[PDB]
Amino acid sequence: AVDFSAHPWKAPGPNDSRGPCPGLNTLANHGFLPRNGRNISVPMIVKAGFEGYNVQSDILILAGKVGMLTSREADTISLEDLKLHGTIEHDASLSREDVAIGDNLHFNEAIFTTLANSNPGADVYNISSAAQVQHDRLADSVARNPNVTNTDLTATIRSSESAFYLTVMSAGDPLRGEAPKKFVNVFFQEERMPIKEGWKRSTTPINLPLLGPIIDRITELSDWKPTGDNCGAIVLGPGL
Amino acid sequence: AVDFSAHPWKAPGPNDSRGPCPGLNTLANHGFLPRNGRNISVPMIVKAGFEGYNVQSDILILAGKVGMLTSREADTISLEDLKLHGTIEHDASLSREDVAIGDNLHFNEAIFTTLANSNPGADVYNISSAAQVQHDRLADSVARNPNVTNTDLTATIRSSESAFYLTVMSAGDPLRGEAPKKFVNVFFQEERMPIKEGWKRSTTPINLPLLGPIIDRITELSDWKPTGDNCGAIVLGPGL
Ligand code: HEM
Ligand code: HEM
Ligand SMILES: CCCCCCCCCCCCCC(=O)O
């Protein structure tokens, strides 16, 4: 029963907190989360993701409580807190630079080129294109970042994020694991719901059972291999 | 400014959730946390630890948000949820069995014998006795549990727990890193504040700066070495 017309996109001001996640950033830019990006709890994320995207509480509780670790507060974050490297934030992002060699927070068009140019000859991104992008992004980090971290955990998180953009920005059947380029590009480049472009919130719930096989197929097609430590240890709080 | 007369010890009833932590169990048994042990948030833990023990928000926010990972709820746990192996719960506990070979949840008198018998000829437990206990408990797990997990992280958590019993149950100067056996034994065996025995809440705040040197000294005296891959990865949620 959400009224999207009561949730206009507004550009964030210079002091509105935004993070490395286009999903949460977009929700804030439409006021599903606080536009200032501050004082955000897991219940707020659960509600916002449901209302905005029809993403269910299973994934948002699991991911949300991990995200909470990035702040110094008892039960809230600022979106910018999520840039904390090695909690969720990882190398070989789709649209951000690796923290060791650049800006791990803001959208970067040069990084995004790989995704933007994927699935040549189609007007959608899909599971095979998403896998290719992941392969190529990881190769770039291995080439250029002397502090690169690549573990089973980061690889899984990366495939989860690719599954998110394929499903949440779909043309309405998220099971298909494909999304119009026009919608995904707006999502990343503007952190806006592409409403005027024709996007509508999925009428199918997006939950762990739906995402699981998509995640696994993306991983499988990405020709991923362990390269190093492979210990899936997360950073448990800031300033440790 | 805490009225302990308004916080009597009551034995947990059959539907009351209790976990592997004597600290939180004791707070629940005195109603500083809900006596039913359910729907417990990090803000509730922060307040309860302050009121009951003069433990500060630094450690309780950090540990509390990690503890939140153990439930399926957005921002609360039941105390029993904390038994989830490999989040905080670990092998070589002071008063519980290793999950692979026994009950990792309930107080176990046979396990507790090692701590109870430590520091012979004194009426206190102290840093050297706590270190000996940790050495002996870990040795027991290495002997009897083929699946033992023993890492920098579990070792730190274990010394933190020893530091907690030495400080929170002290005779009122937690800096000393020694606690009356009569107080610590009641804490573990009954999950009760030993008020009739003469214990009083510390007038000195117990925070990370106070605990840190105690933790480090316990580790130093314990003749510790890691096991296997020494991977500090935590379990990020239940049913994975
Ligand atoms: C529990 C809620 C969420 C948390 C805590 C969260 C956290 C994060 C974090 C920290 C990152 C940065 C990882 C990195 O690239 O280094 C990220 C990336 C991403 N998230 Fe979220 N996220 C959440 C929900 C969502 C939702 C609902 C979507 C919906 C589409 C989404 C889509 C993405 C995408 C596509 C990326 C990849 C960005 C890139 O690689 O450049 N997230 N998330
Ligand atoms: C408030 C002050 C606290 C005190 C004094 C305290 C004390 C202790 C002690 C002494 C143990 C060791 C029990 C043993 O080895 O048999 C322990 C274990 C544990 N504590 Fe706490 N604790 C406190 C707060 C917390 C908090 C905030 C959390 C998480 C929300 C937590 C979670 C646990 C867990 C999961 C264990 C089990 C680890 C294991 O032995 O395997 N504790 N605690
Ligand atoms: C088991 C994979 C489910 C997808 C979870 C990805 C969300 C990333 C945040 C971290 C929370 C759990 C991570 C994980 O188990 O993959």
Ligand SMILES: CCCCCCCCCCCCCC(=O)O
């Ligand atoms: C210097 C901090 C030591 C105290 C940590 C107590 C353990 C809390 C549970 C896990 C949360 C952080 C992990 C850790 O650094 O020990």
Ligand SMILES: *[C@@H]1O[C@H](CO)[C@@H](O)[C@H](O)[C@H]1NC(C)=O
């Ligand atoms: C943050 O949110 C809580 C819960 O709604 C509220 O009590 C508090 O006043 C808020 N603080 C700020 C600075 O907005």
Ligand SMILES: *[C@@H]1O[C@H](CO)[C@@H](O)[C@H](O)[C@H]1NC(C)=O
């Ligand atoms: C993705 O789209 C390309 C181009 O249409 C196609 O070759 C490929 O088979 C598709 N992959 C999947 C998984 O649908």
Ligand SMILES: *[C@@H]1O[C@H](CO)[C@@H](O)[C@H](O)[C@H]1NC(C)=O
């Ligand atoms: C990063 O890699 C460089 C070059 O190998 C090394 O000096 C450094 O210790 C590594 N760690 C970090 C994060 O600085």
Ligand SMILES: *[C@@H]1O[C@H](CO)[C@@H](O)[C@H](O)[C@H]1NC(C)=O
């Ligand atoms: C409180 O915790 C219970 C599990 O003990 C859970 O079912 C519930 O969602 C939480 N809040 C309530 C009562 O809705």
Ligand SMILES: *[C@@H]1O[C@H](CO)[C@@H](O)[C@H](O)[C@H]1NC(C)=O
């Ligand atoms: C602990 O107490 C014993 C027995 O009195 C004593 O020998 C030992 O030195 C004490 N250790 C510390 C750290 O005070």
Ligand SMILES: [Mg+2]
């Ligand atoms: Mg990144």
Ligand SMILES: [Mg+2]
């Ligand atoms: Mg244990």
